[PDB]
Structures are given as C-alpha cells and as structure tokens.
Amino acid sequence: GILTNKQAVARHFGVKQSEVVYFSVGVDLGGYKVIYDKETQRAYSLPVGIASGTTAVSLSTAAVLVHSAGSVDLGSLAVSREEY
Amino acid sequence: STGILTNKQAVARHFGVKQSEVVYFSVGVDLGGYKVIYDKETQRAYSLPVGIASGTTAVSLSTAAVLVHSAGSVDLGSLAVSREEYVTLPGSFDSGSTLNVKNELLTYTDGKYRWDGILPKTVAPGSTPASTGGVGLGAWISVGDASLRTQLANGDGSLIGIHPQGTLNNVLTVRTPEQYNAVGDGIADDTSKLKEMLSDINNVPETLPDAAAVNSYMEQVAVKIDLTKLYRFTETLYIPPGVSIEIPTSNFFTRECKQGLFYDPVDKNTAAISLMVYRKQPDGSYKLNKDVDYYPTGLDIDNGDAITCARKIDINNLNLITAPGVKVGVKWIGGAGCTTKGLSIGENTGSDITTARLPRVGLLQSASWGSIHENLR
Amino acid sequence: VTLPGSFDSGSTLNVKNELLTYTDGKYRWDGILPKTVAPGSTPASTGGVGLGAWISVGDASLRTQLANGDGSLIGIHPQGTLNNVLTVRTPEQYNAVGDGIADDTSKLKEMLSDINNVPETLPDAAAVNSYMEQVAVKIDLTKLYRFTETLYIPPGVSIEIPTSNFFTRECKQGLFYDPVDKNTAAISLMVYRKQPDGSYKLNKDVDYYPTGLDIDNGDAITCARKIDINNLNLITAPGVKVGVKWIGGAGCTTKGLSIGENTGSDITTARLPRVGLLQSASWGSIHENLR
C-alpha cells in the first residue's frame, strides 16, 4: 500500500523507493530526496542538505514544510525545479 | 514478486507504455519486444530502441546506462536525451552533485543543464556551468523551457534563425537609445543614456598622453545610430569618431519637434553638440576642448597645439532643438571629410522669437576641409 | 505520450496526444487518424509541418524551429512577425570571419550569388538582359573582409557601411583585396563580350573597358544597372592594378565610396591600388563625394 505508492512517486521523480518519505509529525527527514503528503496526495522534492536528526514539525496545504532546522516552501522549490 | 509487478506498473504509467512492455535488466534476459528496461540497482528506467530481435539477450548495463546485448550495443542515456526523457537530480550547481547518465539534469538558477562530456561528472558545491566546463558541445547543454526563456532573454539573437540563412544577431547592427532605456519624451533627462550609447561605440578619454593616443580613436569600428523619439539632454554631447546618426525625416520649420535631440542646460553659455578637438597642455598632454567659444585654426593643426578627433562622422536628418538663450547649436570643429544631410537646427515654436526653442548661433565651423553639408536647415 | 521508436523506425499514431520523436524534436499529428509512418520517414516527407499535418511540440522542437526558421514565430509591433521586416543581408549570415586575415572570398561570393546569380556565359542578348530585371537587395558591411579574387557585382545590389573612410590609417570596415595575381581589379561591374560563336562571356580582363560603339553594335552588352553604393571602403594589397572597374554602369550611383588606406609614409607598402577607379559606358552615373 505505502510501498507501492513509494514506488509510484519514486519513478515519477527518478529516485529510489527508499528515498521517498511520508510526512508525519516528528518524522526524521535526513537523507530523503522526496516527501509525500498523504492528505493532499502530493509529492515534493526536498531541499538538499537536511541532516539526519532533523524532524518534521508541520506541512501546510500550501506545501510549506516546517522542521527542526527551519522551513522551506516546497512549492517554490518545485517551481525552481520545474516540477509542476 | 508482487513488488516487481507493481513496479512495472509504476514505470509503465510513467512512460505511457503497457505493463507487459517493461523488462527488468538481468544478465541473460530476453530483450525482444520490450519498450522500456528497468535497472533494479540504480532504480532508473530507460526506453529501449525499437527493433531488438526476439531471442536477443542482455549482457551488461553500466551505470551510464550503456546496454550491451547479444546482438550489439546501445547508449540508453543518449536515446533518452533524444526522447526528452530526463531525470532532474536533487540539488543544484550550488549544492553540488555527481552525474552518471546523459539524461540527468542539474538545476541552475537560470534553468536546467545536461552534461555532454565525460561521465561521471562531479560538480563541487558553489559551482556554475561556467566554472565547471562552460556551455556548448562536449560540456553543459541548456535543456528545457525555463532555460530557453533565460537564454532568449539574455542572448544576442543567435537562437533565432533568419533567411536566407544565418541568425538574427548577424543582421542587427543599428543602435537606439531605447536599448539604454531612454525615456524619449523630451521631458526626462536622457543625458546619461545618450552618453552611454556613444561611449559603447567609441569611448575616448577626455585626457590623453600624446598625439598618437588621440589619433588612435579615429581608427575604430563605426556604428549607425537611429533616433526615433525625442531626447532631452542637459550637458554638451561630444560625438566621437566613427558615428552615423539617422532619423526618418528632417524637420522643416516645425512648431513641435517630436524626434531628435533637445538641449536644455542650466548653463546656457554653451553648445548643444560638439565634435572632438584636443588641445595641447603645458605638460605636453592633450585635453578635450570643452570651451564653447574655442575653435581650432589651420595653424593649430600644424603647431600640434590642436589635434582633431573628428572623423568618419555622418549625419542624416538629425533634428536639434535648444532651450531659448542657448549660445551655440552645433560646433562642427575639426570635422574634415565629415558629412551631413538634412541636419535641422531649431524649432518654429511660435511668433515670439525670444521664447522659441532655437539657439542664438546655429552652427560654428572650423578646420573642416572636405566636409559637405547637404540641405542644412 | 511519447511513443516508442521514432521517424527512423516508423510507427502508427492513433491519438491526438501521441508524439513521435524525430532528430530535431517531437511532433504530434494534426491530420486524419490513424496515421501510419513508414520506417525512414521525416516530418517533411510525410505531410510537412503545419495545421492539419505535423505540429511541433515540446521544448526541443521549439529550439530547432526557432533555430532554422525565418523569424515567423516572433511577433513584432505594430503588427506582423519578424520575417516581415528583415530585409538586409550581411557577410555574417554566411559566417564570414570579418577580421581581414581569413580569406572570406567564397562567403562574399555566395552572398552576392544569393541575390542575383549571373552565369559567366550566356547564349544571347536577351539572356544577359534578363539579369537586370531581378529583385534588388541591400547589403550591410560592418566588419573587414579580406578577399583574393575579383568580386563581380551583379545588378540589383545596394551596399552600405555606417561611415566612409577618410585618410584612414587602419581600415576596419570594408573590403580588403589581397590576391596572388596583382594585375587584376578588386571590384568590377559586369560587362559581357560577344564571342566568335555569338554567345557572350563575362569580362574578366583587367584592362578591358567597353566603348559606346561596343554597346551599340552588340560587341559588348552591359549587365550593370540598379547598383547603388553608400560608403563602401575598399583597400587593397600594395601593387594591385585597379581598385574599382565601373564599366557599363549607366545610371549606377555611388556616395562616399572610399578607396585606399593611408597605411604609412612609404607609398610603396601602402594598402592602396595603382589605379583607383576606371570608368566607361556609364552615362548618367553619379559619384557623390568619392574619396
């Protein structure tokens, strides 16, 4: 279920299945390349350089991700990456 | 197991092919009939060339996606490039990355790029395409819409083909003040823009070491200028050598000048436009004449006291209006062999001459042997 | 959906959103479906590109369309497209180097040829006279082009440079004639001479000039008209016999034609010709401010 979705998202972005993480409060974001929002059913490339130990605080409907080390508008990152 | 089947589906839906058309790479697998191949180790998929005979089996698949099979070889990365089937790597030139396949793109602040050189390619953090090989064959190649927009915006027209052959940059040779964002309403002060436009053509220093120095400036590429709007300026413009000025038509007793130059200085005891003549200094150097009343004599030209820097200047329909009270319109000094057609000075503002936009003295000329003024108004 | 294969392999399109990859980008079929594409096909050989046929799709296709077009994809003000206003020609369109070092001869010749390609041999009077009834085109020379064989200007040509040389020490824009055989002319208009068999051959003899009589009795036929020169700068290697042969140019006009370079004090090494200009059979010809 979650594993097949990870496969689908991974193939869309060209990453490994293990490089996709689902958002949840407290989830560790270190090392993942793509994050998936199970509520909106949208995926986003993660900014590079998120250290192991950095956990997710919140993810808005506008794709603003707040975590331990700060925050990132995944929407803006996706635009820069032409991922629409 | 069932994971393989679901993965084939994900891949199939991505490329728009059938689930049965996806094959996993493995030494010895039959490649015949399949449309897409999947590398389970790198977890990357590639469209396969059409025409693989049935019974043809896989031999090896490199991390650069070069596939060797029983009937030959094929670079799947190159094929992917031709089919615009790309993978945008995480990160960017700023973060750094390592590319292994020809169909991998790295994001830069102005668009994406693929690497056309030797693979693998390592990009250190803080890099730019420029600092890591440059753009062009065998190096970085611009890819995608965002990259095309920025290239078009920051180029010279080389991306635009024209007839019978060649590109747009090959035929764009005229300059305009609009390239420098001049307002052209005869109200805003466009002086700095006009001066930059001229400097970009022939930038001659106001002070020069010797005669050889001043003379070198008459040996530069000449450029044509097109003035289609009205430009207000407030300091004397000095036309450098190698300049052609053009305007569609010449004014003739016009009440309201709409195209050309409008000189509106604080100090009216000056000239609107002047050619360049350098005067000898005590120390032996030369300074550009900036004195309104100065004009060089034949003697000066022989004494070395004056050196002209007015040559290869052509004027076509230049209209020059001036604020009332301005002393001189045009100082045609040292312009030997320089020519003029339809030069039109002054505006027929209205009945009262004291408020008309024309100068006290229209044109003052010296040291201009061989110059021709055709239909001067 | 980008179909497997390509135009090389051939394919069959069934839906409007299917793309077929070619060497310069992708295309969708805008005509009747299904559409069969035989192996070894090209968009141009299977319907052409345009409404109702192959339609270019995607960024790769856009790049090649723009790169090989005429500017018709670029809108301009107040209306129309870029190709509607691009009328001038330049040696740069033909990749001339323009440094006055490289031999740009074939490029210049190709530029002239693309305007009016006049054969050096013609059957009769009517044939040569036809080349004077062709569309005229303006040429802009903004760099310095070295060439090594006499250039023959065909009728219907306008040549301009931003300014005219004047006792110029180092020519930067114009033509520099630098041949092996210096007993030649740098530039010449076209005059055809009658042959024993009645046919006509282009004059390529440096000393030849047609007489009024020649033109009258058909011994010579001019192919020099509708030619206008504004500011052409022509310098040449020291020792070149003639700079410009203005022969048979009736009604042809010139303004600011500037011949020769003020290279240095030694006239023996100055880049100027022995004879600047030689003119005959050019009634009604006007040279304004010739240098």
Residue numbers in the entry:
A (entry chain B): 14 to 97
B (entry chain A): 12 to 388
C (entry chain C): 98 to 388
Give sentences from the paper.
In contrast, CBA120 contained multiple genes for putative TSPs (TSP1-TSP4), genes that are more commonly associated with Podoviridae rather than Myoviridae. Analytical gel filtration of purified TSP1 revealed a single homogeneous peak at ∼252 kDa based on regression analysis of gel filtration standards (data not shown), suggesting that similar to all other tailspike proteins with known structures, TSP1 forms a trimer in solution (predicted 82 kDa monomer, 246 kDa trimer). The TSP1 trimer assumes an elongated rod-like shape of approximately 170 Å in length and 75 Å in diameter at the widest region.
To identify possible sugar binding sites, the crystals were flash soaked in high concentrations of readily available mono-saccharides (mannose and glucose) and di-saccharides (α-lactose and α-maltose). Of these, binding sites of glucose, α-lactose, and maltose were evident in the difference electron density maps. All glucose molecules exhibit the β conformation. The binding site is located at the periphery of the hole generated by the D3-D4 intervening region, adjacent to subdomain D4. The glucose engages a single subunit and the interactions include both direct hydrogen bonds to the protein ligand-water-protein bridged hydrogen bonds: The carboxylate group of Glu639 forms a hydrogen bond with the C1 hydroxyl group. The amine group of Lys662 forms hydrogen bonds with both the C1 and C2 hydroxyl groups. The backbone amide of Lys615 is hydrogen bonded to the primary alcohol hydroxyl group of C6. A water mediated interaction bridges the backbone carbonyl of Glu639 and the C6 hydroxyl group. A second water molecule bridges the backbone amide of Glu639 and the hemiacetal oxygen atom of the glucose. The sugar-binding sites this study identified are located remotely from the proposed catalytic site, suggesting that TSP1 acts on a glycosidic bond connecting different saccharide units.
